[PDB]
């Protein structure tokens, strides 16, 4: 019934209407000791309905994440548990259908990840064991497996050890892999008519060309080198390679697993001809020939854009290298690429035009870059770059020539053949542009070329034009505004605000949408307001015009952040206008609660909410409190970890904002305390933010300070997570009454010295270090000894010697410095006992103290920059990079007044003779 319980839930879940329930009672079913063991158990069942395994699959992936590790790395699930999961997982991935087979290739992945290499050594003798010659089924999945826990490297860089995982992983996969390679390409030219087997080799073949990329992406390993000849051969004949039985002519956007196989086979030459030129010289011309004469024989067909794009970044690779340049080098090597592969590649084609109208927002993905640059004119534009990097004046020119054509063309009938203008606007530009566009825009431009001209003359007119052949260019005009701001004068800018506007109030997706992202940029820069309100306004207005659904709503986020920064710009301009925002910015919270979808939506949603009360004046801050909570509260109900994050930041704002915890907020701070909460990895920074500000506004709120010092215990013991530890300890000590911490000041004490001892961090060692300097200025140096030889006693005086004098130095940020060398300094000079109980300490504390003085000469995606807190408390009269050693002095000197020359003269002998000088030039200074 175990099983059948899981099971259960599993399909329950999958009804809309137990959902809630179904995630809950999952959630508790998860705690048992052998959950994870039944997940998979389900999972692996054939019987069951594809939904329920499905869900059971998705699920164990989710679990996975959150149970498997914590922080630090350790195993949170029993010993026996975990090695048979393991056990089991690899051959139950082996076994499944693509669409699970993926689910739990992420699992394995997130598996591999914290325990690959050392904590799972059967592993590569596991999967090397299952590979065959007449299983091919089997080899694509043991393979499968494979690459996905190999795949992590690619991203990765370099390391004294890296090589060593690899070499720990090539000794074990080099034979069986090249092996089953030759293997696999005999049985292809056997199989030349067996469609079913045909297919099932080249999903083989796919996976091992993922695999030989994952083994070079760091280095080319010696049996890879000696042994390429073999490889690249069979790699050059696929790419070739065609037949009747692998083709789909009805098929128009899906790529096949022949064009798959030919993609990621172009992924690789690329590879080789960007990191082992030279080993790899001989063949690079042999692929240049292929790459080419595959490029001209390709259709227009989105079936092959991946594979035209990875076919041209091994051109652009090959652009790159001054020998085979020499080869596009000729006058007419120009206008045959010119002609041949990009002309046709970049021409608009029908069917985007009908993404243009069924899509909006997916055109517009595509237009614009940051994710999804898998595309042709992008790996067409980039190729240009290089070419023209080469020779300028060659490739401007033939380019030139046909530009020159397409302006006749457009011009005889604007309506027929509009699709000319977008082509050469595109051109220009690709030409235009000189490096890589960044979010400043364009660095450079070529200068053959006149950007501003080709805009009076081509891309304002369109932008006024009365009836226009076709919109895309409107759309193309606001692009290019968008992309050559940097080139266009600040008051030719200003001159589009106007029409610009009037975009605005269209119900043409694309161009108010790129209308919206120009007035952003453009207002950005005007800043270092009536049309700001009119403009939230039309905004807001648009967000809502294409219906409240979930799903849809959110679809827009390019809009959404445009209205964070125009909120970003006018900051306090529009105080009056704020209330009815952040009531509609909750009202779209409140929709978007019911199915959050798009991230960056809800971010931006959130980062303008956050903006709005950071303006806000704290007299009527209330006001605004009372329109959220409700909505946030229900957040909390039903926990929507989407946005919880965001909530927690806010609220913890508001919190930290009023002099008093807003009563709709009071009820938060206990089941705040509920250790749950502290235990979902990506949430710790935003709650210790509202533990915080609790804290701070109000302790009483704590009545039993007890499962408070609870969170302390669990945050500071994790290596991972002392920096929340400390921050939070800050604030207890600082501002919590002491005869209300005088029962737990021994705790805390030794908490903080026991990582110390058994566990230290470079981090923590310092962060130590600026936390005693910390409260040896605000709670004194006395109640500072007393604190730490609580412990045991002359803990103080070890302690300060080996681990803060020595480290004091050795703290880089600036503020930490400051802090903690002013509360050094403040044990010297303001320390009853220190100077006369340890003798020994003051020229060693001394000494640093002249030395440090002396120095001058993931959860990132729910954080709120608007309410970002990135100014942590300090002592303001003291600049971090003057004053610091002027205080010093002046502190030193304020010092010998009060006994007249007598200490400075003492220590001197004591110093060493370097610090002495210092001393000297510090004292004068
Ligand atoms: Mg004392």
């Not at 042999?286 to 001209?296: C, Y």
């Not at 970044?313 to 652009?319: G, H, I």
């Not at 003085?853 to 990132?860: D, E, T």
């Not at 004053?883 to 006994?899: D, F, H, Q, T, W």
Request: hydrophobic fraction near 45%; include cysteine; charged fraction near 20%.
């Amino acid at each position: 019934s175990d099983l059948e319980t899981v099971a259960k839930f599993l399909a329950e879940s999958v009804i809309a209407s137990t959902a809630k329930t179904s995630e809950r009672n999952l959630r508790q079913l998860e705690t048992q000791d052998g959950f994870g063991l039944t997940l998979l158990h389900v999972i692996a069942s054939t019987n069951l309905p594809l939904s329920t395994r499905l869900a059971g699959a998705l699920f164990f992936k989710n679990f996975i994440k959150r149970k498997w590790v914590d922080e630090n790395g350790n195993h949170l699930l029993p010993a026996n548990n975990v090695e048979l999961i393991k056990k089991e997982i690899v051959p139950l991935m082996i076994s499944l259908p693509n669409n699970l087979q993926v689910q739990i290739g992420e699992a394995i992945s997130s598996i591999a990840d914290s325990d690959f290499p050392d904590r799972w050594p059967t592993l590569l003798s596991d999967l090397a064991s299952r590979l065959s010659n007449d299983d091919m089924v089997t080899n694509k999945g043991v393979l499968t497996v494979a690459h996905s826990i190999f795949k992590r490297w690619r991203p990765l860089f370099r390391s004294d050890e890296l090589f060593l995982e690899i070499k720990l992983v090539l000794d074990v996969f080099t034979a069986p892999f090249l092996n089953l390679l030759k293997t696999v390409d005999e049985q292809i030219t056997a199989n030349e008519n067996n469609k079913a087997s045909l297919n099932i080799l080249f999903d083989v073949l796919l996976v091992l060309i993922k695999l030989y990329y994952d083994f070079n992406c760091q280095d080319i390993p010696e049996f890879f080198e000696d042994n390429i000849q073999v490889g690249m051969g069979i790699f050059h004949k696929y790419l070739s390679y065609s037949n009747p039985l692998l083709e789909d002519p009805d098929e128009t956007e899906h790529a096949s697993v022949l064009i798959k196989v030919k993609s990621s086979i172009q992924e690789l030459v690329q590879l080789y001809t960007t990191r082992y030129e030279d080993v790899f010289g001989p063949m690079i011309n042999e692929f240049i020939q292929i790459t080419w004469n595959l490029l001209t024989s390709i259709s227009n067909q989105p079936k092959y854009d991946i594979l035209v794009s990875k076919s041209l970044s091994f051109l652009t690779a090959v652009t790159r290298i001054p020998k085979y340049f020499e080869i596009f080098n000729n006058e007419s090597a120009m206008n045959n690429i010119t002609e041949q592969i990009i002309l046709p590649n970049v021409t608009l084609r029908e069917e985007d035009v009908e993404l243009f109208e069924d899509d909006p927002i997916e055109y517009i993905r595509r237009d614009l870059e940051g994710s999804d640059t898998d595309t042709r004119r992008r790996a067409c534009t980039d190729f240009l770059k290089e070419l023209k990097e080469k020779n300028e004046v060659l490739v401007t020119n033939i380019f030139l020539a046909h530009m020159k054509g397409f302006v006749d063309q457009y011009m005889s009938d604007p309506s027929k053949n509009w699709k000319f203008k977008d082509l050469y606007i595109y051109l220009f530009t690709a030409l235009a542009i000189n490096g890589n566009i960044t979010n400043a825009g364009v660095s450079s431009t070529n200068n053959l070329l006149n950007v501003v001209d080709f805009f009076t003359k081509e891309i304002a007119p369109d932008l006024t034009s009365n009836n226009i052949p076709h919109i895309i260019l409107r759309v193309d005009a606001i692009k290019y505004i968008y992309t050559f701001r940097n080139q266009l004068t600040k008051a030719q800018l200003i001159e589009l605000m106007p029409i610009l506007a009037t975009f605005l109030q269209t119900d043409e997706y694309v161009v108010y949408t790129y209308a919206a992202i120009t007035i952003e940029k453009i207002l950005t820069i005007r800043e270092s307001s009536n049309s700001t309100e009119i403009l939230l306004k039309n905004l807001i207005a648009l967000i809502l015009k294409h219906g409240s659904s979930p799903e849809k709503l959110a679809e827009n986020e390019f809009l959404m952040r445009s209205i964070f920064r125009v909120l970003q710009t006018s900051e306090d301009s529009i105080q009056p206008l704020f209330p009815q925002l952040l009531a509609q910015f909750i009202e779209i919270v409140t929709i978007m609660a019911k199915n959050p979808s798009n991230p960056r939506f809800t971010h931006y949603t959130f980062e303008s909410i956050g903006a709005i009360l950071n303006y806000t004046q704290r007299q009527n801050l209330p006001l605004l409190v009372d329109s959220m909570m409700p909505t946030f509260l229900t957040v909390f109900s039903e926990d929507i970890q989407e946005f919880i994050p965001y909530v927690f930041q806010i609220i913890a704002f508001v919190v930290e904002q009023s002099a008093t915890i807003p009563e709709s907020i009071k009820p938060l701070a206990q089941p705040l305390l509920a250790p749950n909460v502290w235990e979902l990895k990506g949430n710790i920074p935003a709650v210790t933010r509202l533990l915080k500000s609790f804290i701070k506004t109000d302790s009483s709120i704590f009545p039993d300070l007890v499962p408070v010092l609870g969170i302390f215990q669990r945050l500071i013991a994790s290596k991972a997570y002392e920096v929340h530890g400390f921050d939070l300890l800050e604030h207890i000590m600082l501002l919590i009454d002491m005869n209300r911490l005088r029962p737990y000041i021994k705790q805390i004490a030794v908490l903080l010295l026991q990582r110390l001892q058994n566990s230290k961090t470079e981090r923590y060692v310092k962060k130590l270090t600026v936390f005693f300097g910390l409260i040896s200025n605000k709670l004194g140096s006395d109640f500072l000894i007393h604190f730490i030889d609580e412990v045991q006693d002359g803990l103080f005086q070890q302690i300060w010697g080996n681990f803060i004098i020595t480290t004091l130095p050795t703290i880089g940020n600036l503020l930490d410095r400051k802090i903690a060398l002013i509360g050094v300094l403040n044990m010297v000079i303001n320390g009853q006992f220190f100077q006369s109980k340890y003798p020994t300490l003051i020229s060693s504390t001394m000494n640093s103290i002249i030395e440090t003085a002396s120095s001058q000469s993931g959860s990132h995606f729910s954080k709120l920059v608007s309410i970002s807190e990135k100014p942590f408390d300090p002592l303001p009269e003291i600049d971090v990079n003057n004053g610091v050693r002027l205080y010093v002095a002046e502190a030193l000197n304020k010092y010998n007044a009060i006994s007249g020359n007598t200490f400075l003269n003492t220590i001197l002998p004591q110093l060493t003779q370097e610090n002495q000088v210092k001393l000297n030039q510090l004292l004068v200074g």
